[PDB]
Amino acid sequence: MAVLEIIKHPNEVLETPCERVINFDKKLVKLLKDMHETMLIADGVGLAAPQVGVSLQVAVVDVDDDTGKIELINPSILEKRGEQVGPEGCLSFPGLYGEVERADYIKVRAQNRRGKVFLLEAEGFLARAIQHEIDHLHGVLFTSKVTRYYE
Ligand SMILES: CCCCC[C@H](CC(=O)NO)C(=O)N[C@H](C(=O)N1CCC[C@H]1CO)C(C)C
Numbered sequence: 555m556a557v558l559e560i561i562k563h564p565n566e567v568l569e570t571p572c573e574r575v576i577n578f579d580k581k582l583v584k585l586l587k588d589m590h591e592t593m594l595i596a597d598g599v600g601l602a603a604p605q606v607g608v609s610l611q612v613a614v615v616d617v618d619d620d621t622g623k624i625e626l627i628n629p630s631i632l633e634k635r636g637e638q639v640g641p642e643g644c645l646s647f648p649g650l651y652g653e654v655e656r657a658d659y660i661k662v663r664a665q666n667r668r669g670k671v672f673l674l675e676a677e678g679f680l681a682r683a684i685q686h687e688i689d690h691l692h693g694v695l696f697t698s699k700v701t702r703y704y705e
């Protein structure tokens with residue numbers, strides 16, 4: 555493993571929508587493994603590939619032990635229901651926090667390391683984290699959805 559450098563907002567790679575993953579290869583596996591530990595070391599509950607300088611639709615979330623890490627490749631949100639309002643920060647904007655409204659329930663379709671397609675349903679905080687990461691894969695930063703920044 556390697557502790558990847560997390561890209562901060564002073565950077566164009568953060569707004570570049572990502573390309574889909576095509577070759578589910580060893581290098582993709584190493585990317586995910588390095589991302590998960592790098593994320594955890596930095597106290598994040600999620601991380602997207604553009605945050606480590608890679609413009610591929612790859613992300614990982616790990617908000618609870620039971621659930622555990624959930625790697626997402628080429629994810630798309632098939633459905634959303636209800637809404638939730640709450641505080642969000644981002645590893646690419648250290649120190650910045652704002653109020654953000656997201657869907658409460660989400661149904662997601664994504665691929666694992668071997669390219670197999672699975673279906674995941676989430677809600678509350680895990681659904682928020684997932685939406686935040688999926689935004690990153692499309693070049694969208696939370697800053698564009700902040701209702702107000704906190705004092
Ligand atoms: C909540 C939405 C998902 C956030 C994902 C980010 C990591 C990230 O930037 N991913 O792209 C994170 O872990 N953010 C943390 C965060 O926002 N937290 C941690 C506790 C709850 C919330 C408080 O704002 C801190 C590290 C800034």
Ligand code: NI
Binds near residue numbers: 643644645646686690
């Ligand atoms: Ni972020």
